[PDB]
Symmetry: C3
Subunit: 340 residues, 3 copies
């Protein structure tokens, strides 16, 4: 909600309280999304100041407060800053920002990250260019310097992040995306490569000294209809764990597919149908193994722009004999959202 706007500076303080519950059989240990209370809230701010007619400065911060912990020792479990960056946009020259933000490959994966509760399985956090990462400098251009309507691109520099964990670490890298949007249609191409850290290389699964990720996307977004598809691959970038051996590392290779079809009725109901499959190739020891594989059926009902509720149902196609231990059970999520 825009709580402030004076002297060319406008601040939008936003947030949401999400009452959420997952239903899966057993201890949800073998299910797709788990089981139980998953309630949470978000708080963030987006600021934008007009320094003059061509120049705009802006900043954004977003935080995640879990609502399913006790007030005891586990109280902070899952809390984290999702985004934190500042930047400038100049006339038709482009924008530049730095901080914790979305990797450029997400410029593609965003196409199908539209499910009510699940979806966007390949857009992992602190995983190079596919989701939110820290220390990325991003330049973005719209309408090719204003010369070509609908043609945009971006280049992104990722700085080394040597964390205590191989999963949350990364070396230096560069990535970019090019997308084009013409009347309801949009097509995107995104790619990034980076160095892997010592610790990443010391891992049992995955082999290489460079991580890569690329994805392409296609969409039709107009007339209440939303159809989107993504296809991408990765080398030594996707994190995996052998639940049996309790081993961990990255998938030498993956081929990922995501499709989504939804429709927005005028009365508020937005049904969703999706399909996702991510398969790893050459996993040291297992060979080829599916990591994600399911159908989704779900629906969101918007009471208005501040209130909604939904049910997301995952029909897991993973099979009980999956070599890595990936769960095969279904999961149903029900949620009630208030937001501003």
């Amino acid at each position: 909600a825009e709580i402030y706007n004076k002297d060319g500076n406008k601040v939008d303080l936003y947030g949401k309280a999400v009452g959420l519950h997952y239903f899966s059989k057993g201890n949800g240990e073998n299910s797709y999304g788990g089981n139980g209370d998953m309630t949470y809230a978000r708080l963030g701010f987006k600021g934008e100041t007009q320094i003059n007619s061509d120049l705009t400065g802006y900043g954004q911060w977003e935080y995640n407060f879990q609502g399913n912990n006790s007030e005891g020792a586990d109280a902070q479990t899952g809390n984290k800053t999702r985004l934190a960056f500042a930047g400038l946009k100049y006339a038709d020259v482009g924008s530049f920002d730095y901080g914790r933000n979305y990797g450029v490959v997400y410029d593609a994966l965003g196409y199908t990250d539209m499910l009510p509760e699940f979806g966007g399985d390949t857009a992992y956090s602190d995983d190079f260019f596919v989701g939110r990462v820290g220390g990325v400098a991003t330049y973005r251009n719209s309408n090719f310097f204003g010369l070509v309507d609908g043609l945009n691109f971006a280049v992104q520099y990722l700085g080394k992040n040597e964390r205590d964990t191989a999963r949350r670490s990364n070396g230096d890298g560069v990535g970019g995306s090019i997308s084009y949007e013409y009347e309801g249609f949009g097509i995107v191409g995104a790619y990034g490569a980076a160095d892997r850290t010592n610790l990443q290389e010391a891992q049992p699964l995955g082999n290489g000294k460079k991580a890569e990720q690329w994805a392409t996307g296609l969409k039709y977004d107009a007339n209440n209809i939303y159809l989107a598809a993504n296809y991408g691959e990765t080398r030594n970038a996707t994190p995996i764990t052998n639940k049996f051996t309790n081993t961990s590392g990255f998938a030498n290779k993956t081929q990922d597919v995501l499709l989504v079809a939804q429709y927005q009725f005028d009365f508020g109901l937005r049904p969703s149908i999706a399909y996702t499959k991510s398969k790893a190739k050459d996993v040291e020891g297992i060979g080829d193994v599916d990591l994600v594989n399911y159908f989704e059926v779900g629906a969101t009902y918007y009471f208005n722009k501040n209130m909604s509720t939904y049910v997301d149902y995952i029909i897991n196609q993973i099979d009980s004999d999956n070599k890595l231990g990936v769960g095969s059970d279904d999961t149903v999520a029900v949620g009630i959202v208030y937001q501003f």
Copy 2:
């Protein structure tokens, strides 16, 4: 403070900075409330949107930031989300919400949870239905579908919460309350029973496979006067610890009494007089033991709706030979509150 209100959506961003200090002799280890700096702040939001004339959606989140930690490793000690839920209210049919919220038995204990700094001793957190808990779905009805002014009720479904700790855990359960309010008077009855988790049962103190809590309350609230009384009992629900043995578990049984009398002068001064006593019965090993037992004398002075200060004084009646190790010393709390 209502910082936003447009298009049927109003957001109230609220909070407070509480400069607080406890005075108890010794290292406050044997006193009622401890000793030293207890400064803290709160931040939360309450949103409410009119979806149409009969339907209202709403949400709320509240957080606790301790102000008495260092900027070092202990910086997060005591921080936590207190409430996080979303819901809908429909005409005279009732309201329904889900998330981290207050158990239904608190519909009763709330009567006497009015002391300046202390009080409300039996309304523990993550303790079934008496205080704030996670994963509770609550239905509330006001004025019996609009047919009976002053007659309200509520039913609440608590979902299993298997935490790493027996104290912060719970199995499934149901609870409800019925209350009636007629011209300054109010009477309430509340009750809930739930399953105890494996871990709760593996504890040294307390024996059973079901937890129960009920409380009744009576109050006279009008003419600057506030008198209230609560009486309730519990089975295997109240957490206790033998400081000697360093043993822990739940009280097989407890009988709790709370009384409160206060008066609000027109100039801002609100004196308080209270009495609290919670005694455990059949504690495995000790027999009957008091857990809480004191008189309170205190006062709050309101400068206005945003500023106040108070002194709360606990005259501990617990005795030095208390079998569980419960402290017997007095405690005086002084505080200065700014809030919005």
Copy 3:
């Protein structure tokens, strides 16, 4: 930004998103400020209510959210509440507040704590009276009860804080400051002494049962010019660590000097030139050792009151043979700030 103001109560919700990066050679282990992403954000509130013409109540809370952690286990690293206090100001009688706030000696050190990114090296946190500490009651008087324009003073009572760490602990103490400001000029004197805790005394470095800190400051602040200088000393108060032995404690004695000269051009550019040197004396084992020693050259460019960027460059004068292991490499900080 003042988001609320009605009925004599005004709330200012403020914050900033700082995209920040440090450049130092090596693993920045031997450099002055480290190396890598240092992005962060701040959120806080300052409230003030007019209780009547002479009386004002107020409160403030400020938090620090690190933007350079992963969304993993390290997500909370560096997060903390910086300030949390409430108070009252009465006519010309003075103000009084309690909570986590700045020690009185900072009334002096504040003079030179003006560098774009670094500086203020001696104003440590949870270090008695020099920076932010918890549990301090502060009385401040302006214009000597309104009888002497420009003459102010303050006295501060620090309550014992026995933390798990010798570095973040303190015993009781008192401190005060007196300052005078006449037309661009300002002079200050500040001093405080406190008890050291058992744990502080059990430390390998430093010897005494009382901690002291005093600093004097002088400044010329007017005509776009800002020149300031501080000189102060301390006994058993400054924390130090022998990187070789991995020993820790406090410096028996230190003599600290800080100078700063800056100029604010009308177009937005504010160049900075500074010099800092803190040397410890009688360190048990080493003798005399520099703790801080460098020149700073830097500049901030203000696009407007909400947006700025800067480069701060530290020309470290510490030498590679420094007995404590203090780093000798240079550090360059670049940052982009959005704030409201």
